[PDB]
């Protein structure tokens, strides 16, 4: 089989559509998500045109091997999609309607800067390579883009599944490549964070505020690294900094500066000066909660 | 091959059945379970009808490629089911009886609100897409729905495996689609929870409460926090972190306040008696010692009222 | 191809055998084990009979597609076995001798009640479904059941690999099914447990009692709780959490009560050495110091009587 | 099919190119990375040559089975690449242009000596075995070597993707083998290390010294060891344990000596003042309080000079 | 296809060779290693013999399906090898030369008794089952056994890759089986251990002795058990739990007795001086402070004599 010949010179337009059936396994660490969807393709092949009056049939159904089908690939997939052809239908004018159900593991980067109050745009890039006979270009059939109502991504709210209607046409290894960007929009159900993560990690910090203070103020450090290890499956370590990987470098400083204060107050009163000891070791007791609110509100202004 | 032609205009009814052979790997985190079952399909294809007297046989056996077979798919599966055709039998009137043994990883959401005293309804959705030649509809053959007696799901009690007999017929991308809902009902085996998880998490906070009867309050208070997060680390494989709140997500969130209010009490009592007032020190440190166990069950009993 | 026709009415007997080549990955948590074995099958197909005088040869070798072969399946497997046909030999009477080497992931429940001093019977269930032409029944050829001497299952002693010679014949979805039970008996090599798990779990309970002899009782008594959960989660990969109770899930829950009742004492003795009651303080704090090693000895021996 | 015959004697030159589409899963522990790329191959096959005028076509497209294609393999791959042929184009002189999109798991050793300030050269080795008919040699078509702009490797900066243009030709099992070295060069994003890994672990060493200013020094000095190993376990997923020594494996090793020599000082100063000598006690306990931060900076700067 | 007929009665000799291309994933817990190698096979098939002057060709290349090829299998593999035929060459006398590149997950037991100063012999067992027509025996072609210079096994030193030249011929299920033993010899790069595991594991229970010089000894001696069990969990990925005992599984079990006997001495010295006897208190508390490092030195040297 060879591609449909052009009537003039025009490129062959392959109309596309993705209908999400399932979305699952959004792996934050691997920056992948699995998808199970319908992929619909439409193109005109005049060599397949027929007379409806003489044939008596409105539509003809073909086997994938019997006709020419465009080689559509996904850009950002780990391995090639697992695809099962559902249907191939040809109208009398020769317009082919292709439908396959596929599953794929998609590579899509995630921006964790605003975690756990972040929103993401997951991408599914469709691509086609041109043949020497003719150029193949991709288009979006908005009637065939969508999602099942039951599509659930645990811990996320699904907002929209849209496609950037204009393909990105470019040359790659001396041939044309037509790329479409399908985008799935999500937002984190951060409701849970306060209850289990935000509040109890803080009730360790808050519990951090003379030789007995050495056993007291150092525990709220040993337990902070245990809340960390005890819930690290929900804390992200990025190559850059997050508004939470910063709330982390602040708790580490705040747990230190508190034990710098209680290491200076219990050493100033012992080095013959107990007058100025109650001057800084009472002011830091109202200074810390306000130095914190100011700092966390200063951090918040930048990132979120 | 092409679908069987309609005698009038009627859609083709494909009778279905799922017989569970094995149920395994209920992954709470991934919200998946693996299934190994028989899938039975029945439909009328008049083009295959024969006379038993002339043929000499009462049944005819075909190879899947030799005849038309409906494209049945599962909705909520990770990848397509691994299927092996067991048998294809045709009766004299053209009634096809199809049987395959398949294995599949099923996506089925779990409600953890009542964990570990929860019950779930796992779903297996069967679906068929209609052809331009004719409309295909699914039906349940209750005689071919069931489960092996040996079907075991470790940590769960299997109640029932039934099917919603009425399919959900709907249009999708300009074609009819027929969807059936097979439901496997399961309740949890919560017996174990108290023994190793529920009771020992309490025997740390009761050991925070047996120090309200001081500098010793630090070594008894600040420890039954460090050890609570260590049972919470040491038994996290049994504790679920959901996007919402569970009756256990809260039953552990009350512990975070109770371990704090306990060290707010012992941070106010050991600071009031030191600031020249040891009279009112024994007034709050002694009532909080009988106040905490009653504030607790009142709270845990208040939580229990809403979730259960 | 179609099944061999019956001479009278009698079902077709398919003689079976499993020869274990490798046993590996006994996953206690998943309750699976992987197997690599030979599967031998024998049945009489008179249509394949030949004269050794005329054909010259005493045996005919066939390709799987060339002849009829019974569809033999495993019941308790996650997915279908990865099989490679080694040989198909047809003898003059028409007796077919089939041999394949397969590998499979087997689902076999494990009883952890006596862990780590437990023994198990792993099962491999062979099954065949009868066809419309005739009924198929399975049999055990004891000459073709066995295991390689090198078959090793790390951490276990392999006792025997036998088959229940009588198949379980039953009806399933309007057809006959013939099921054979192959059993691999294995026992646990518990020698290691004392050295790395049992003894140090105890040198923390023992070191909690070596402090029942006052402000130092706070630092000791509570540490041998924080360290107990560290030996636990520090070696949890060797401790099983079942839906039911084990003599080890019980051994580890008595420690939770003994670490608590040990800090019910260190809290009463600290309340008695104060609150103007010094006398009766040395009456219970000294008696509990000889009471518990024996209250423990009695309890663990009482537990042992029930389970093992 | 057979290889193209040589016009004189010359080996068949197969021009190669790898264009990276995706790079992912750089597994530091397994020393693997996954790749998804285009593989382009070009060679002259005169038997496929044609006249463009007489044929009416300027290019001829073939199916992989229709023509001879060189068996190109990757040396350092776990299993064989998953490949999908995109295009096969033949020009009038019979120059074949082959293009496939493949995915592969690549084995490439990583040097962790300078972690987290390390740079790596990941390799992809292309290889071809010669046939008896003729010798096949590999070449680099620099026009077909490259990477997509979007190629991202999380936690790494991608420097260059080049190929060593000269193949390594050698004999292996009585035939010639031609090997090309494709090098994807990378470097880390060490900015993050200070914030979350380097500084908090250092704050523990710093807070161990903020106690060199007597029985309370035992409870304070030993905690910043218990917490040191908790920062370690708490962030071990970012700390590498190699078969050799890393400047960080040494930086972690210096902390083990500095946390010991710190509690050797606080075990000698709190024992000298108690053994009737409190004069010389303030001589070493005060000098070590300004000695440690400078003995550390000197040591870490001495270590740094060697490795990085 | 059928096997080559014997000229007299002699068994067919299949000459073998394995050339290692890659060695990776030595999984200590699973007792597996992955291999990627060439497998070469040679046997005489007279039916394929040809005249060199008449044919014009000195070698004839065949497709695997075109000729008879011996079914060679690996004994100790999880699943069957992933194999890709590279070349099949026939010499005029009818000597076939077969070459395939395969990848396989090999089951090979590991002896951890001397860990981390252990050496291992990994095995790859090649096997052939004889056919009814004739007996097939395996041989080693030492010219075709070897390994690539780049073959690296992370954390191990590769010593040699040799084959036991004499096959183990035996009967299995009424047929002859010919088994060859290929051995890859490796040793552990134990240099790492001192740095990260060896010296720091000690410094914890070395720091338990730096407190045998009284009420502070309660707080210091007991957190040592808390930190040791954190150094252990903190580096458990490098400590092996075997069904048997090691020079390490004991080295870590002596520490459990030494961390206890340490707190038995402090549970006796800090209780004897308090129970009106402070004379004999300085007699045993000072002697145990020089007794422990020598009782340890002796014990570790006594242990060493047995195992290594
Ligand atoms: Cl794809
Ligand atoms: Cl499916
Ligand atoms: Cl079979
Ligand atoms: Cl099977
Ligand atoms: Cl082979
Ligand atoms: Cl194999
Ligand atoms: Ni498929
Ligand atoms: Ni299958
Ligand atoms: Ni196979
Ligand atoms: Ni190739
Ligand atoms: Ni492919
Ligand atoms: Ni292959």
Curated annotation (Swiss-Prot), chain A:
Membrane topology term reads: Multi-pass membrane protein
Q: Which residues of the full protein are shown?
A: 47 to 235 of 359
This chain's function reads: Cationic channel with similar permeabilities for Na(+) and K(+), that is activated by an increase of the proton concentration on the extracellular side. Displays no permeability for chloride ions. Shows slow kinetics of activation, no desensitization and a single channel conductance of 8 pS. Might contribute to adaptation to external pH change.
Subunit details = Homopentamer.
Residues in a coiled coil are none
Q: Which UniProt keywords apply?
A: Cell inner membrane, Cell membrane, Ion channel, Ion transport, Ligand-gated ion channel, Membrane, Potassium, Potassium channel, Potassium transport, Receptor, Signal, Sodium, Sodium channel, Sodium transport, Transmembrane, Transmembrane helix, Transport
Task: Respond yes or no to whether keyword Cell inner membrane is given for this record.
Answer: yes
UniProt superkingdom: Bacteria
GO MF annotations for this entry?
extracellular ligand-gated monoatomic ion channel activity; identical protein binding; potassium channel activity; sodium channel activity; transmembrane signaling receptor activity
User: Regulation of activity: what does the record state?
Assistant: Tetraethylammonium (TEA) and tetrabutylammonium (TBA) inhibit the proton-activated currents in a dose- and voltage-dependent manner in vitro, whereas the blocker of acid sensing ion channels, amiloride, has no effect. Channel current of GLIC can be inhibited by inhaled and intravenous general anesthetics at and below concentrations used clinically. Ion conduction is also inhibited by lidocaine and by divalent transition metal ions such as cadmium ions.
Locations listed in the record: Cell inner membrane
Instruction: From the Swiss-Prot or TrEMBL record, give the protein name.
Output: Proton-gated ion channel
